[PDB]
Design a protein around this ligand. Sequence first.
Ligand SMILES: CCCCCCCCCCCCCCCCCC(=O)OC[C@H](COP(=O)(O)OCCN)OC(=O)CCCCCCCCCCCCC
Ligand SMILES: CCCCCCCCCCCCCC(=O)OC[C@H](COP(=O)([O-])OCC[N+](C)(C)C)OC(=O)CCCCCCCCCCCCC
Ligand code: HEM
Ligand code: HEM
Ligand SMILES: CO/C=C(/C(=O)OC)c1ccccc1Oc1cc(Oc2ccccc2C#N)ncn1
Ligand SMILES: CCCCCC(=O)OC[C@H](COP(=O)([O-])OCCN)OC(=O)CCCCC
Ligand SMILES: CCCCCC(=O)OC[C@H](COP(=O)([O-])OCCN)OC(=O)CCCCC
Lengths: 61, 75, 105, 378, 52, 267
Amino acid sequence: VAPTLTARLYSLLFRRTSTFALTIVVGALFFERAFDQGADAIYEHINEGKLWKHIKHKYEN
Amino acid sequence: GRQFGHLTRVRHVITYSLSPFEQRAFPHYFSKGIPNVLRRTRACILRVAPPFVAFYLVYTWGTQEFEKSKRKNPA
Amino acid sequence: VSASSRWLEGIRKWYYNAAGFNKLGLMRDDTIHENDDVKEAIRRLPENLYNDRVFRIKRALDLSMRQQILPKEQWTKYEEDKSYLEPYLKEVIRERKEREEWAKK
Amino acid sequence: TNIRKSHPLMKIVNNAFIDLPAPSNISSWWNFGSLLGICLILQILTGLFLAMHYTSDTTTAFSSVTHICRDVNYGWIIRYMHANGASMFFICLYMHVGRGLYYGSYTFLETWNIGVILLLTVMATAFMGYVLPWGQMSFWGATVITNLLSAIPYIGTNLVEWIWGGFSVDKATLTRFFAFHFILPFIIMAIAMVHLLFLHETGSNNPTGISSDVDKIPFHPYYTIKDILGALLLILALMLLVLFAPDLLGDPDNYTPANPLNTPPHIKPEWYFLFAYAILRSIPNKLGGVLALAFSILILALIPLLHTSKQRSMMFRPLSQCLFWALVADLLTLTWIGGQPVEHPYITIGQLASVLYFLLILVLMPTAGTIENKLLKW
Amino acid sequence: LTRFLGPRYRQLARNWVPTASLWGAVGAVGLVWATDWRLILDWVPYINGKFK
Amino acid sequence: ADLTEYLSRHYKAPRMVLAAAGGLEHRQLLDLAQKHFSGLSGTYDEDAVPTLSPCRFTGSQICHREDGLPLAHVAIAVEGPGWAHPDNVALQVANAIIGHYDCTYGGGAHLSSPLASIAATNKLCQSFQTFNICYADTGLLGAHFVCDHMSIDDMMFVLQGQWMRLCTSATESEVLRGKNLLRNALVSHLDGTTPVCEDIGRSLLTYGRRIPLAEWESRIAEVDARVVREVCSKYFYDQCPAVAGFGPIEQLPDYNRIRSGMFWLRF
Ligand SMILES: CCCCCCCCCCCCCCCCCC(=O)OC[C@H](COP(=O)(O)OCCN)OC(=O)CCCCCCCCCCCCC
Ligand SMILES: CCCCCCCCCCCCCC(=O)OC[C@H](COP(=O)([O-])OCC[N+](C)(C)C)OC(=O)CCCCCCCCCCCCC
Ligand code: HEM
Ligand code: HEM
Ligand SMILES: CO/C=C(/C(=O)OC)c1ccccc1Oc1cc(Oc2ccccc2C#N)ncn1
Ligand SMILES: CCCCCC(=O)OC[C@H](COP(=O)([O-])OCCN)OC(=O)CCCCC
Ligand SMILES: CCCCCC(=O)OC[C@H](COP(=O)([O-])OCCN)OC(=O)CCCCC
């Protein structure tokens, strides 16, 4: 068995502080979209049929 | 201000310390933690509980006496 | 000497165990508040009592950090609480009272 | 040698937040020092961003606030942060003061008395802030409190009419309160720096009240991360009020514009003033109510003079611990009575709780420390 | 001004070029992310959630 | 009985080396070896063979506070590789750059080592020394110093800053100095029959052979600035040290602060 994922994460990304920062700023970019996309999906699901974007199609023209 | 090396005089005291990268940050968190929280509450519950219970009694009585004072009577 | 003085001593041992500094291994004179008289008395302690006071305070501060206490076997027994600082503090106060009585004349 | 230690600027930051020797055993009750600093900064940022849209004139003071919550981008989140941040400010202030009573920190006279001045100026700040939206409670809260100053003998009315700029709370009163509400938080921050100047002369107390010079640790990383964690809990408490219950602590009357003719039925302060509002109404006399109302807070400056115990902290003083929580529950009683009408039996309870407040601080708690000294034979 | 012209000072520049190039990427990616700069972000696969 | 058990267990012919150095032919030594050491059980004692298992290194700190002593002693180190590892040559070159200092040295401010220069100019210590202690598959690599109670922090700061400087930004000229210091140290030490006899005996147990001086020169000449940066980072950068303190050490930095001195945020 090769070394664990956390071990290869350290030597490859976290050892240098510069790459440690590049990992964070790149991880912040994808986390924002993935979290906002998922979080909004939970809010709209809990409030199905009540928000304006659900009743929007009725008043198209 | 005060600086390290000018604080006070200590002699004959040894201190052993482990690096944080070689020990657990949550060692026996529930095993020893929960018994210690029960001990910490039991050792202080008789100091803190009575006055807030005394408030809860005054709060309950005074709110009951308040409503029943304005309600009408056959007089 | 009588049954009533054992009840005054009985409540003093109760308050002692209620004060709870014996649970940290401390003694009564370890807990005293350091004013100028107390600081001088501590300054006059012999080397052995000073070093013992320092480690008990250090050990109690270490316990207070962890919110822990010692086992009951290692608590300070009320009968064994040594007033190691009172004879020094009584003499420091007596000297100050003399300086304060000369200042009146 | 080391740039962090020798540079004229960094050495002050280094000797305050980095290399400061701090006790190894200070508990969560010591986190409220930094949290007060955060609340003060948080109130200044949101306060400034509200001043970019608020106007201090009666014809538009109410609607300019409405203009923020409706039209301004994220104005509603900035306002409720400001209103609830003030309440979090007073939560932290009361924990901060209570920590000092219980653990004996008041023995630092200069640090403590400057704290009393910080409590008064923060109270005066929030009192003037509540006038600015110019709602019903904004007007009538200002009326009942400022009228108390007329009870001062021989200069009462002249002093009240000078603070008003007229004959009642009016246009001139609203504008200057905005100016004073602006200037004071910076005067507060400067006094908070002197508050730290006298503190670092001695270092922090600790839960035991025993000196910790034999066991000190650097403030960084141990208490930098502990204050960051504590600050994170503060944002949780604030945002729970802002995003799920922004109208819980506020009064609905303030959503009605001011009306000098129509009086609301129940004029109640914010929760952080109810204890002192109760003490005011429990005294029948007017001038006596003002003195008791001012003595309710200035009494804190007397605690160092009323310290009888040979021990500093209440940690090893059970008989004083019970009286300490009797002071909290008695203050929780005055808080409760303050938000209730002045009718039977609340009148009698408010008078008993008022006497119990001053009796606990002046008589009972000093007497307990003496009894505790005798039980330990010193 | 001309103290820093020699073999050693060129060796020091060599050793810090990989680091200085990475901090520039941290600053660049941090500037694009902080401002939602659509000129660069539109080319990234997963952050195309714009719907022009 | 404990001692005789220790002797019969360990003083066995396959685990000993008869070394000699000076005016003598190897024949008469080997003859004398057969003449006197033949009567010794060897090559099969019993099923009682000792074997050295690995030894765990632990990042940790031991602090013996004693304010009666006039100067503090501090020893800080990381885990070294062991006897047979080729990295010891490059490590000794890096240690030679940092070097060592004493208050009786004449150079003072003009010394090449930045730690020695700053230590002498600002009077941060009475002495310091680097070391690379070697054991089987492990070792202690670091430095030891002694200083006034108000110089423990400055001394630790300058020391760690030189480990980090060599890990990240070592230069070619100073590395040549470390190679030249090592060449002089190696030849100056093997001067006399007793040093050479020690080098023979110890090497046969550790290396299983005598490494000629010409081979040490080959490994030293292979070292350059890139080797030092790679080799120092392999053992120093972002590693948990073992710290030992003794004396007036109130100003000895906390272990977390010491651990933070093992990396640079700028790198
Ligand atoms: C003037 C303004 C009036 C406004 C009224 C506001 C309404 C009040 C609402 C009540 C909330 C109560 C907060 C929670 C209290 C928890 C207490 C606790 O956990 O137990 C007792 C604790 C014991 O800890 P020791 O340090 O003695 O020993 C520990 C060894 N394991 O001992 C301690 O930790 C106590 C430390 C001090 C806490 C301060 C809380 C009181 C706030 C108001 C004080 C105002 C004074 C003028
Ligand atoms: C104009 C546009 C500009 C945009 C720029 C965007 C940049 C985003 C951040 C990237 C910088 C990372 C720097 C870094 O990573 O170096 C900081 C430090 C390192 O971490 P480390 O000690 O593991 O050492 C690391 C050791 N290694 C490297 C060997 C693993 O990070 C920590 O320690 C501190 C982390 C804790 C976070 C909380 C701090 C906020 C304040 C309080 C918040 C709540 C109340 C206000
Ligand atoms: C804007 C208002 C205030 C701010 C920002 C502030 C901030 C601080 C800070 C950061 C500390 C050190 C850390 C800590 O002890 O938690 C401190 C300590 C202290 N403060 Fe305040 N404070 C304020 C008002 C007050 C008030 C109103 C009092 C009491 C009437 C007070 C009394 C004290 C005391 C006695 C200490 C020392 C505590 C100790 O060492 O244990 N301060 N303050
Ligand atoms: C210790 C600092 C501060 C405290 C405790 C505080 C407190 C308050 C409170 C409780 C209100 C009533 C808000 C409401 O009911 O809607 C208020 C209003 C206001 N404050 Fe502050 N404030 C502080 C600092 C500042 C600063 C520095 C400024 C200006 C730079 C400011 C500007 C305003 C404005 C414009 C209003 C009226 C808008 C509104 O009612 O939301 N505040 N303040
Ligand atoms: C302008 O009125 C503001 C009020 C408020 O609660 O602001 C936060 C308020 C509202 C209704 C009634 C009164 C109000 O003001 C106040 C102000 C107040 O100030 C003090 C607080 C503590 C100790 C003394 C005083 C005084 N005076 N004590 C009680 N109520
Ligand atoms: C220093 C203050 C900078 C203020 C910039 C600003 O507020 O944001 C404007 C754009 C928005 O992204 P875009 O893809 O719409 O682009 C629309 C272009 N107008 O963001 C940028 O392009 C960032 C540019 C940074 C240069 C220093
Ligand atoms: C914009 C980003 C600024 C980065 C500054 C920074 O993170 O400070 C350093 C410390 C951790 O590094 P260290 O103290 O181990 O030093 C390492 C020495 N080699 O981090 C913290 O814990 C400090 C808290 C800062 C609060 C604002």
